[PDB]
Amino acid sequence: IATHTHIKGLGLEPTGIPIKLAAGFVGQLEAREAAGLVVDMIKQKKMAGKALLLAGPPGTGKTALALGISQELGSKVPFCPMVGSEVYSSEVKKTEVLMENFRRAIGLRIKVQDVTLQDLDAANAKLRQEINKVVNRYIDEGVAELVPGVLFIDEVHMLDMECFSYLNRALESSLSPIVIFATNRGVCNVRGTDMPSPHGVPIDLLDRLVIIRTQIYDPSEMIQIIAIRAQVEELTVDEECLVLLGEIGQRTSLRHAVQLLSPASIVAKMNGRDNICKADIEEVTSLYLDAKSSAKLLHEQ
Amino acid sequence: IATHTHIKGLGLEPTGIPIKLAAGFVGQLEAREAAGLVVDMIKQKKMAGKALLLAGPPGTGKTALALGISQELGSKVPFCPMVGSEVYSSEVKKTEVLMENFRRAIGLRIKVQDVTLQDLDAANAKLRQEINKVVNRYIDEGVAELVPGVLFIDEVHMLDMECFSYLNRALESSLSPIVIFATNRGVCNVRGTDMPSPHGVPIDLLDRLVIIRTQIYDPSEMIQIIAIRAQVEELTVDEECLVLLGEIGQRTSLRHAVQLLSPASIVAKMNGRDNICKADIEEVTSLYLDAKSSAKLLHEQ
Amino acid sequence: IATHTHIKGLGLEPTGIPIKLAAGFVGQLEAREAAGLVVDMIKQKKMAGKALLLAGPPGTGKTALALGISQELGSKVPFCPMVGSEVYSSEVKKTEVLMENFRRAIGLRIKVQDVTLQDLDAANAKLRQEINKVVNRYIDEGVAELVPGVLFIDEVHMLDMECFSYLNRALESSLSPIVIFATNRGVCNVRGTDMPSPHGVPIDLLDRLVIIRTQIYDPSEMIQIIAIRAQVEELTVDEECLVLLGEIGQRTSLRHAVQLLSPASIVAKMNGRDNICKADIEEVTSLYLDAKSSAKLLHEQ
Amino acid sequence: SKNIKTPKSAYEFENSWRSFSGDSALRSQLLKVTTPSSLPQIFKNALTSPVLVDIIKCVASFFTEDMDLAVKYIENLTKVPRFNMLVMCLTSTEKNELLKIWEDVFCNKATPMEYAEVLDKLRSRYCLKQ
Amino acid sequence: QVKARKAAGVILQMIREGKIAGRAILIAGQPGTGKTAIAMGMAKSLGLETPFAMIAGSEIFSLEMSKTEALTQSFRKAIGVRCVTLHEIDVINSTGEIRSEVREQIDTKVAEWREEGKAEIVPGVLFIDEVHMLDIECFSFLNRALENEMSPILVVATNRGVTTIRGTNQKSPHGIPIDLLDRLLIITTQPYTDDDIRKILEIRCQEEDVEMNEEAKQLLTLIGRDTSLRYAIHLITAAALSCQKRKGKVVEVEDIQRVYRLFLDVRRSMQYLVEYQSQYM
Amino acid sequence: QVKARKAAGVILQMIREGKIAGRAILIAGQPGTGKTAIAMGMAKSLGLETPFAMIAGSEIFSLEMSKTEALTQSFRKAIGVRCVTLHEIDVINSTGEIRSEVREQIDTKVAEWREEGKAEIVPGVLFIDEVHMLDIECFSFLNRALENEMSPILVVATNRGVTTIRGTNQKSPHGIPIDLLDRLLIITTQPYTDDDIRKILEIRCQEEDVEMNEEAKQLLTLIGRDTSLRYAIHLITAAALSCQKRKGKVVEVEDIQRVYRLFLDVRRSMQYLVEYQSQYM
Amino acid sequence: QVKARKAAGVILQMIREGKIAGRAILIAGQPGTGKTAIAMGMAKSLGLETPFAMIAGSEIFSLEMSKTEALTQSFRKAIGVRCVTLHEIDVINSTGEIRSEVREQIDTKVAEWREEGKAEIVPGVLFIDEVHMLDIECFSFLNRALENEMSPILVVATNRGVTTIRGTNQKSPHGIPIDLLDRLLIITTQPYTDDDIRKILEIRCQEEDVEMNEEAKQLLTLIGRDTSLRYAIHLITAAALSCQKRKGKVVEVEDIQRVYRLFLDVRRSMQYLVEYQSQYM
Ligand SMILES: Nc1ncnc2c1ncn2[C@@H]1O[C@H](COP(=O)(O)OP(=O)(O)O)[C@@H](O)[C@H]1O
Ligand SMILES: Nc1ncnc2c1ncn2[C@@H]1O[C@H](COP(=O)(O)OP(=O)(O)O)[C@@H](O)[C@H]1O
Ligand SMILES: Nc1ncnc2c1ncn2[C@@H]1O[C@H](COP(=O)(O)OP(=O)(O)O)[C@@H](O)[C@H]1O
């Protein structure tokens, strides 16, 4: 989460409505209000047995929304991001890494030292049910407390049918954290089978998902985002270059207009000026292409 | 074979032409005559190095014709039914399941103690040629008599080239039983290959098959079939509901109409009557759909 | 390789322009001159890191040119022909078969007697690197002398990405032989990928390939080829018989036309004629068909 | 009306023949609802000699009704596969009764010479008396 | 579900008179239409003492043990010795390996000890949920296991019409072989009606201690009819906390409108995602 | 099969003169057209003492032993010393690994006994039915084994046109690699005519002790033409049994009519079930 | 190259300022366009002390080693300690270096040296030449290994457009997962211009000790522009040997015309053989 260090929280009023600019979040009012409602649902344990899905385009603040939810849950609540491609591995079974990340998000505090549940298995190991039983005895005795973290899983369609089914049964456990899937595809066959399904998820897991929409940004909001990332990286910018950066973010993605800020500062330093100018953004945009445009130029030429 | 109890042989005249109603069989005169001719071929050891094929629609006598062939050879003669799916048991090799059924069909009597060739392997459990040569020596000595049974194999297209090759090699054995394949498929790809072939069988095995065609039934013959099945089940019926049962069999299948009889008796008992009224049949066919109508309902919405 | 027995060299003038008929070769002037220039490139150390690719239709003398090159380099410089289908072996890896032929192609003479490096690799059984160190120490002492040979790899499209990448790696070794790919496929998908490429060879290896074009033959050149091939097998043959054999060669392939000569001689020996006649070829071409005509005949039936 | 429909296949023809087997009236009118041109497409070697004799006799039932159609139908029966072995497969009883039907029905004085010549030309190759 | 429950009752009478033999039951229909409720209802209606086992789906092909071992253990789970099941006897005598001695010992015991309250046996109702995922290997094992004496009453569930059999190319109804389908009494579950949706939402309101007026109830019934029952059930909790944020005593129609605006359903989000992906990519 | 037998005789005269060299034979024609008869006659005409080995293309996938092990056993079976084959020497000195010491023992012992003018090595014939079923590894092993000086004459056989080489994507004639196909003398076997069918059915009727009039014989010849010969061979036995049930002394056209009506050929049964499947969907 | 080298300089200043954490570099131009040259230029411009770990995507899948073993070996080889790499440290303390406990020991011991300041650490440059050939497991391993603070600077190279990742059916740019593409700084290398081709051919001539007049040099530049630079580099050697054979000294235009007539470029031979393969079909 090196790229969302500015996300302090959802930025909600006492009444639950989001503020237009607060806690690092600028825009995206519907999804922020929905995330606030879901946070209130986690706080009183009404989401036990369900999970969250963020359905929206790329560079739409889904990972920022999950980080805001995890920050809003508590002070040092853990946040485990991962990708579906990470589940496949040559050295460990896919199910094993799935439970590894799943249990890594279950934080506990013992009266005061804080540690994640997967560290207990890593030290004591496979034998996870016994670890669950002893931490249940600990928290029932009151000497320790549990905090459910946030297991964020981007590219949910990449997960296999075995992965989806195992997550469906594994959500039944009382100690489990909130699992936040994220997707941008829609129609996609479930990996490992030929049946189409919404968002590449089977029906048996889609039964228990609470969906939230995230909407694309207008240019002004995107320019505000690039400005916020400019201040957080200790860079200096102006409207003449920020407008071009916003156009570049619109035409490719906000994840490629926020990656270009640092080399713009570097090429500005090579040009002998400490402040980024429009020529710097033109130069770095000419040099470094996005993945889609780069592949397009590769296959066309 | 909980069903097929009413069948007690082909029920033929001494001249060999079948009787229109005898030994449980209704109609099906051409296939019954051919089955009697194959029985006479088996009696004179002429079917060695050959197999039988019953090609026809589902619910047209085929499994019942094989049982008639097995019954006509003698009361002690066994009948081993199986399906093509049954070979794919994971715990035991497919060729082993094939040869196990192959040896289960082979009957012997030691003089009297009636044993299959599978039991002699189980008591002396592979090592196949030892028991084969031993029983050859026994029947040459006259201490034992060989009665080959009927290895019936429905859904023959599900078998693969390894299974068909093993069957083709195993038919060369002198002590083999009569392999009655049964099929309801025309041109089909042999499993494990790509090329279509007749009945999903390779040409090499088709160069030794005696093929018999089984015709589908009229409404009258189907009504007689359901009447026989109802009488053998100790169910009391009338012609009024039997016409409806014949209609249901003609619309979906004969097997479905036969299987609806027991819940019809239960629904009649629920309504305080022993006789199966027409309304009972309407209730049961409204409740229990056949596979095809159920799949048509599931395909919608 | 008894078919190429008549070839003894490229048959070039001192100026390097080919002779029309010399050293068993007839015609094929452009590819002969190109192979002569490649031989002169091989006499100096300028061929290092490169390979040759004979691209042309079948029966145009690609293997003939490879054997001519291997004869031209030295007195008995070794020639190790193979095909791509030879690489796929169940007993040993594809890479192992590749290295086996690759090291069989290398020759070493020691003060004097000659031996292949495969003999050292197998008898004195890390093995490749250790024996390469031993041979490098031996040749640097000025007591062993290297005669590199020719690894002729017919049907290059039959190989896959692993084999091509491994050959690209192994060509950079100092003691490598002159790998001569041969192909008759225009554009083909490299096995293991869905990328069309020229000649079934990947782009990474195609850079280091000197390509030679071989031409289809005039009728008179095919006549002369069949004449010399019949003469070397100690057959006498009529002119009109040669015309019929050349017509058969243009019809199907030159390989079939040369292979028909022995059965033509046997058919002529029957009926007591030492000289082969036209009716013998009219009989033999009817008796034995080529592969394409036979496949067409089977597909008609 | 709905009981007598066009068969799409030899399966359909044989299953219509079985149901209508005992009643000739629904067999003599069966041949009217089908085109004889489709007959060699309907039968794709699925035609036995008793069925051939039955169909010829049924065409004889309505020979005089539509004589051209009869001499079309029998002609179209010549276009079925395995016809030669089929007529070779006839037993002596069917051969004799076909000869009787020839002298009675298909070679009566009522028919004109135009249809009679074609019928006798076909009957030279059906019966194969020798 | 009235027709499906009546069919379950008729099958239960077939079980009680013993006329069902070498036969299984299938419960078809759209997903989430209370199929497991029918299965457990039949199992309890036979008797609370009788065992039950819901094992199957894609749960098989993911456990540490093989598919055949899991199927064997679940099959032995659904045979109650009176209560203790045969699988419990296997765990006491211990996955590891399954010992064949137990069948001989318990056969001797039921031959000897019966009508004493020691070693009598009742057959349970096995339930194989989502059977279309099972391989042809699993169906062959099912055929070999059903023919054994003292087997459980097999029940299977499916929510697909015609599929490829897992492990072969040939298609079939419900992803089951024809030799199985010629023995299955197929119960079909109809979709929920308006009076069923309203009653289910009222039961969930009573369970979760949520009060809401009749306008909200009717609009939520309409939403559940149009969209999904589980979506409406999620809306109950979400609107309850939305009203709690306003310090309200009773959930109002504005809470349902707000939460329907916020939390999308599957179909609406599917529409809004394809409306991005088809055009912008 | 006159032209094919003539070509086989030409290859026999080739083999006697040693002109076959590294080449082999392919028998390419429709199934059941005297392939194995041609190969066995070839091996006999080489000499009655000559060894012979036979194998089907699918037999190597029996799974008792690997593909190459079965091919090695088949190759060793088709070599002799005189008598004993090298497979028999392997069995005497035994499956295990075929150690190279047995080849050295064979070389030294046969050289010593050839010096004494008492025994010599003989190459035999190996026949491979259904060569299109062979894998590409099996073809590579075939080339490797034929490279050996002790190798026997190979006679592959196919009943397939252009098809994919099994285990690869390349389409080649007969499902064989090209590099083998440039060195195969392809003998083609023509389909049987009326007179050949009549002679074969006459010989089979003589063998079966069945007597038939000329009308039934001609009708059966027509059946054999239009429905292949093997179906007529089956009909001979079926009609003999029908005549026996009729208490006759000769099988007539009535019996052939009955048996043709009853027992279908592959074409009519395939047509009947294709027509059903067309109706059914 | 001009723009690509300037981009490499900007990235060089970025790594030198310690701003690369959580990123990698992608060089996504056409093949044979100085990808590896830019890689070694980056490694040299950081410093001669910094190690450079070359690897290509096809090499890891050799059967002597696993994909993860080759990847972790190349990963550890790119990290220098002072001069010695971590793979050399494993060789000293002990792919072949398959040893996990002493990997933990090495990590702990170099960690205490790093904290104590007795021996510093320098991250190098890990170049992966054919990253599109890496499987999804390989990409997952790379994503995991980059998270370590001890990781090197990752550079990947490819010449594929949009394609499907190996081991998956999903299409993406360059056969890389999106989660890695979102971090990669994508350099693109332009094709060589006429002046660049002329210059490169001049240095290749002077290195080869080959003399040409200006007309031959400009014709060879035209040949390189039309077909390929590497083909022209082959023609330099071929024309030099052709002139040496004719007893000339300076390589003339006629020698280049002869060599172009003899040796075919890839596209010309491909077209000539495609004509035959289309004709013979
Ligand atoms: N509403 C927002 N407020 C602040 N930053 C945002 C917002 N939406 C997106 N971003 C920024 O977008 C960048 C890329 O992350 P994100 O857009 O969340 O990726 P994705 O949507 O693919 O998960 C981050 O710097 C993130 O903080
Ligand atoms: N000739 C017959 N007489 C009586 N019942 C029959 C007859 N033929 C079939 N049946 C009934 O039809 C049912 C289904 O057909 P079956 O004999 O199993 O053939 P198939 O294998 O084609 O399904 C059987 O259970 C049997 O009761
Ligand atoms: N230029 C030539 N001069 C004389 N004989 C030739 C020439 N080219 C080919 N042949 C003969 O024709 C045959 C054709 O095979 P060949 O062309 O070598 O196969 P490939 O093209 O696969 O290498 C060879 O066996 C050789 O004897």
- Number of Cβ within a 10 Å radius of residue B62: 25
Q: Which structure tokens are listed for G24?
A: 């990698």
Q: Which structure tokens are listed for E22?
A: 């070498």
* The dihedral formed by the CA atoms of E198, E203, E205 and E208, expressed in degrees to the nearest 10: -160
User: What are phi and psi for residue G153, nearest 5 degrees?
Assistant: -85, 120
Q: Where in chain G is the domain with CATH 3.40.50.300?
A: 3-187
Q: Where are the domains of chain D?
A: 10-126
Which residues have a Cβ under 8 Å from the Cβ of F7 and sit 6 or more positions away? C287, C288, F185, F187
Way the structure was solved: cryo-EM
Question: In this structure, which topology does domain E194-270 adopt according to CATH?
Answer: Helicase, Ruva Protein; domain 3 (1.10.8)
So what's the architecture of F194-269 in CATH? Orthogonal Bundle (1.10)
What's the order of all strands across the beta sheet hosting C150-154?
Answer: C82-83, C150-154, C178-183, C51-55, C209-213, G263-264
In order of D108, D124, D129, the CA distances from D115 in angstroms are 11, 14, 21
- Number of Cβ within a 10 Å radius of residue G108: 10
Q: If you take atom 27 of ligand 1, which residue's CA is the nearest one?
A: A4
In order of G204, G240, G257, the CA distances from G209 in angstroms are 8, 9, 20
Q: Which structure tokens are listed for E208?
A: 């979760």
Residue among C254, C260, C184, C191 nearest C225 (CA):
C254
G186 DSSP assignment = E
Which residues have a Cβ under 8 Å from the Cβ of B52 and sit 6 or more positions away? B38, B66, B69, B178, B179, B180, B181, B209, B210, B212
In order of E55, E87, F114, the CA distances from E76 in angstroms are 12, 5, 71
Q: Where in chain F is the domain with CATH 1.10.8.60?
A: 194-269
Q: Are residues A187 and A224 in the same domain?
A: no
The beta-carbon neighbor of B289 closest among E139, E160, E188 is: E188
Burial F75-98 (b: 16+ CB within 10 A, else e): bbbbbbbeeebbbebbeeeeeeeb
This PDB structure is determined at a resolution in Å of: 3.7
**Cβ–Cβ < 8 Å for B36, B18:** yes
Q: Are residues A149 and A275 in the same domain?
A: no
The continuous run of DSSP H or E covering A79 comes out as strand A79-83
3-state secondary structure of E228: coil
Distance between CA atoms of residues F38 and F59, nearest Å: 21
- Number of Cβ within a 10 Å radius of residue F223: 24
**Cβ–Cβ < 8 Å for B211, F263:** yes
Which residues have a Cβ under 8 Å from the Cβ of E218 and sit 6 or more positions away? none
Radius of gyration over every alpha carbon of chain G, rounded to an integer in angstroms: 23
DSSP code string of chain C: -GGGTT-----B-TTSPBPSEETTEES-HHHHHHHHHHHHHHHTGGGTT-EEEEES-TTSSHHHHHHHHHHHHSSS--B--EEGGGT--SSS-HHHHHHHHHHHTEEEEE--EEEEHHHHHHHT--HHHHHHHHHHHHHHTTSEEEEE-EEEEE-GGGSBHHHHHHHHHHTTSTT--EEEEEE--SEEEPBTS--EEETT--HHHHTTEEEEE-PPPPHHHHHHHHHHHHHHTT--B-HHHHHHHHHHHHHT-HHHHHHTHHHHHHHHHTTT-SSB-HHHHHHHHHHEE-HHHHHHHHHH-
Residue among A73, A44, A94, A96 nearest A150 (CA):
A73
Residue F267's Cβ-side half-sphere holds a number of Cα atoms within 13 Å equal to 16
Which residues have a Cβ under 8 Å from the Cβ of A173 and sit 6 or more positions away? A132
**Cβ–Cβ < 8 Å for D47, D86:** yes
Q: Which structure tokens are listed for G274?
A: 């495609």
First to last CA, chain G: 44
Q: Final residue of a domain: which of A213, A243, A277?
A: A213
Instruction: Check CB contact of C94 with chain F, cutoff 8 Å.
Output: no
So what's the architecture of E3-188 in CATH? 3-Layer(aba) Sandwich (3.40)
Q: Are residues C139 and C278 in the same domain?
A: no
D102 DSSP assignment = I
Q: Final residue of a domain: which of A213, A231, A260?
A: A213
**Cβ–Cβ < 8 Å for C69, C180:** yes
State the pairing for strand pair G24-27/F263-264. Answer: unpaired
Distance between CA atoms of residues G102 and G109, nearest Å: 10
Distance between CA atoms of residues E35 and E40, nearest Å: 9
Q: Are residues C247 and C138 in the same domain?
A: no
First to last CA, chain C: 35
3-state secondary structure of G259: helix
**C252 is annotated as contributing to ligand binding:** no
The continuous run of DSSP H or E covering E74 comes out as helix E67-77
Distance between CA atoms of residues E98 and E68, nearest Å: 11
Q: Is the CB of C255 under 6 A from ligand 3?
A: yes
**Cβ–Cβ < 8 Å for F208, F240:** yes
Q: Helix H segments across G117-185? A: 136-146, 178-181
* Sign of the C-alpha dihedral computed for residues D85, D87, D88 and D93 taken in this order: positive
Report which bound ligand comes closest to the CA of F179. 3
Of B67, B183, B216, B254, which is best to mutate to test ligand 2, by the most ligand atoms within 8 angstroms of its C-beta? Answer: B254
Radius of gyration over every alpha carbon of chain F, rounded to an integer in angstroms: 23
Residue among A16, A43, A49 nearest A210 (CA):
A49
Residue among C160, B182, D6 nearest F279 (CA):
D6
Instruction: Check CB contact of B30 with chain D, cutoff 8 Å.
Output: no
Domain that holds residue B123: 21-213
* Sign of the C-alpha dihedral computed for residues E93, E97, E98 and E101 taken in this order: negative
CA G184 to chain centroid, in Å, comes to 16
Distance between CA atoms of residues A8 and G56, nearest Å: 42
Q: Are residues B184 and B40 in the same domain?
A: yes
Distance between CA atoms of residues E264 and G267, nearest Å: 55
Q: Are residues B154 and B201 in the same domain?
A: yes
Residue among F60, A238, A39 nearest B165 (CA):
F60
**Cβ–Cβ < 8 Å for G27, G156:** yes
**Cβ–Cβ < 8 Å for A241, A265:** no
Distance between CA atoms of residues C75 and C112, nearest Å: 14
Q: What residues does A26 pair with on adjacent strands?
A: A21
In order of A190, C165, G166, the CA distances from G163 in angstroms are 20, 20, 9
Q: Is there a domain that residue B265 lies in?
A: yes
**Cβ–Cβ < 8 Å for G80, G49:** yes
Q: Is there a domain that residue A1 lies in?
A: no
* The dihedral formed by the CA atoms of A23, A29, A35 and A36, expressed in degrees to the nearest 10: 70
Q: Are residues C85 and C56 in the same domain?
A: yes
The continuous run of DSSP H or E covering E36 comes out as helix E35-46
Q: Where in chain E is the domain with CATH 1.10.8.60?
A: 194-270
A151 DSSP assignment = E
D103 DSSP assignment = I
3-state secondary structure of A205: helix
- Chain F residue numbers touching D130 (CB-CB < 8 A): none
The continuous run of DSSP H or E covering E224 comes out as helix E214-226
**Cβ–Cβ < 8 Å for C194, C182:** no
3-state secondary structure of A108: strand
The continuous run of DSSP H or E covering D16 comes out as helix D10-19
**C59 is annotated as contributing to ligand binding:** yes
**Cβ–Cβ < 8 Å for C178, C42:** yes
**C148 is annotated as contributing to ligand binding:** no
Angle between helices D10-19 and D49-61 (to 10 degrees): 70
Radius of gyration over every alpha carbon of chain D, rounded to an integer in angstroms: 14
3-state secondary structure of A111: coil
**Cβ–Cβ < 8 Å for B37, F262:** yes
Residue among E166, E174, E184 nearest E67 (CA):
E166
F241, F246, F265, F277: best to mutate for the B interface, most B CBs within 10 A: F241
Q: What residues does F64 pair with on adjacent strands?
A: none
Distance between CA atoms of residues G165 and G154, nearest Å: 19
Q: Are residues C157 and C242 in the same domain?
A: no
Radius of gyration over every alpha carbon of chain A, rounded to an integer in angstroms: 21
Q: Which structure tokens are listed for A151?
A: 């297991």
- Amino acid residing at D58: C
Residue among C38, C172, C153 nearest C105 (CA):
C153
Determine the distance in angstroms separating the CA of E130 from the nearest CA of chain A, rounded to an integer. Answer: 10
Q: Helix H segments across chain G? A: 3-16, 35-46, 67-77, 86-93, 101-116, 136-146, 178-181, 194-208, 214-226, 229-245, 253-262, 266-279
Distance between CA atoms of residues G56 and G77, nearest Å: 14
Q: Is there a domain that residue B58 lies in?
A: yes
Distance between CA atoms of residues E235 and A41, nearest Å: 12
**Cβ–Cβ < 8 Å for B266, E19:** yes
Q: Which structure tokens are listed for F232?
A: 């007529």
Q: Which structure tokens are listed for A72?
A: 């809003």
CA D101 to chain centroid, in Å, comes to 12
Distance between CA atoms of residues E11 and E240, nearest Å: 41
Q: Is there a domain that residue B5 lies in?
A: no
Distance between CA atoms of residues A82 and A69, nearest Å: 16
Three-class DSSP labels, chain B: CCCCCCCCCCCECCCCCECCEECCEECCHHHHHHHHHHHHHHHCCCCCCCEEEEECCCCCCHHHHHHHHHHHHCCCCCEEEEEHHHHHCCCCCHHHHHHHHHHHHEEEEECCEEEEHHHHHHHCCCCHHHHHHHHHHHHHHCCEEEEECEEEEECHHHCEHHHHHHHHHHCCCCCCCEEEEEECCCEEECECCCCEEECCCCHHHHCCEEEEECCCCCHHHHHHHHHHHHHHCCCCCCHHHHHHHHHHHHHCCHHHHHHCHHHHHHHHHHCCCCCCCHHHHHHHHHHCECHHHHHHHHHCC
Instruction: Kindly report the CATH number assigned to the domain that includes residue B278.
Output: 1.10.8.60
Q: Are residues B37 and B178 in the same domain?
A: yes
Distance between CA atoms of residues G41 and G56, nearest Å: 18
Q: Are residues C70 and C186 in the same domain?
A: yes
Q: Final residue of a domain: which of C187, C213, C239?
A: C213
Distance between CA atoms of residues C92 and F141, nearest Å: 11
Three-class DSSP labels, chain F: CCHHHHHHHHHHHHHHCCCCCCCEEEEEECCCCCHHHHHHHHHHHHCCCCCEEEEECCHHHHCCCCHHHHHHHHHHHCEEECCEEHHHHHHHCCCCCCCCHHHHHHHHHHHHHHHCCCCCEEECEEEEECHHHCCHHHHHHHHHHHHCCCCCEEEEEECCCCEECCCCCCEEHHHCCHHHHCCEEEEEECCCCHHHHHHHHHHHHHHCCCCECHHHHHHHHHHHHHCCHHHHHHHHHHHHHHHHHCCCCCECHHHHHHHHHHEECHHHHHHHHHHHHHHHC
Q: Is there a domain that residue A271 lies in?
A: yes
Q: Are residues A31 and A136 in the same domain?
A: yes
Q: Domain tally for chain A?
A: 2
**Cβ–Cβ < 8 Å for E153, B277:** no
Residue among A243, A239, A228, A241 nearest A267 (CA):
A241
Distance between CA atoms of residues E228 and E226, nearest Å: 6
Determine the distance in angstroms separating the CA of F126 from the nearest CA of chain B, rounded to an integer. Answer: 19
Q: Which CATH superfamily is domain G3-187 in?
A: P-loop containing nucleotide triphosphate hydrolases (3.40.50.300)
Q: Which structure tokens are listed for G205?
A: 């001539």
Q: Helix H segments across chain A? A: 29-43, 62-73, 84-87, 94-104, 117-124, 128-141, 161-170, 203-206, 219-232, 239-251, 254-257, 261-270, 278-287, 291-300
Q: Which structure tokens are listed for B81?
A: 């039914």
**Cβ–Cβ < 8 Å for B222, B246:** yes
Distance between CA atoms of residues E183 and E179, nearest Å: 7
Q: Which structure tokens are listed for A159?
A: 């997960």
Distance between CA atoms of residues E3 and E78, nearest Å: 26
Q: Which residue has 């006629």 as its token pair?
A: G254
3-state secondary structure of E78: coil
- Number of Cβ within a 10 Å radius of residue G182: 18
3-state secondary structure of E54: strand
Instruction: Kindly report the CATH number assigned to the domain that includes residue B184.
Output: 3.40.50.300
Determine the distance in angstroms separating the CA of B137 from the nearest CA of chain F, rounded to an integer. Answer: 26
Distance between CA atoms of residues F207 and F197, nearest Å: 15
Q: Which residue has 């006679």 as its token pair?
A: F155
Q: Which structure tokens are listed for G109?
A: 């011991």
Q: What residues does F263 pair with on adjacent strands?
A: B212
CA of A16: which chain E residue's CA is closest? E245
Distance between CA atoms of residues E142 and G8, nearest Å: 64
Distance between CA atoms of residues E159 and G147, nearest Å: 43
Q: Helix H segments across G95-193? A: 101-116, 136-146, 178-181
Distance between CA atoms of residues F111 and F114, nearest Å: 5
F117 exposed, middle or buried (CB, 10 Å; 0-12, 13-18, 19+)? Answer: exposed
Q: Is there a domain that residue B13 lies in?
A: no
Distance between CA atoms of residues A275 and A289, nearest Å: 23
D37 DSSP assignment = G
Q: Are residues A183 and A241 in the same domain?
A: no
CA of C289: which chain F residue's CA is closest? F186
- Give strand ranges (E) for chain E: 24-28, 52-54, 79-81, 84-85, 121-123, 125-128, 155-157, 162-164, 171-173, 184-188
Burial D8-43 (b: 16+ CB within 10 A, else e): ebbbbbbbbbeebeeeeeebbebbeebebeebbebb
E275 exposed, middle or buried (CB, 10 Å; 0-12, 13-18, 19+)? Answer: exposed
**Cβ–Cβ < 8 Å for E175, E163:** yes
Q: Is the CB of A59 under 6 A from ligand 1?
A: yes
Which residues of A are documented as binding site for ATP? Answer: 56-63
Q: Is there a domain that residue A2 lies in?
A: no
Q: Which residue has 């156009």 as its token pair?
A: A247
Q: Is there a domain that residue A14 lies in?
A: no
Residue among A260, A288, A277, A263 nearest G11 (CA):
A263
Class of domain F3-189: alpha beta
**Do at least 3 CB pairs under 8 Å connect G with C?**
yes
The continuous run of DSSP H or E covering G25 comes out as strand G24-27
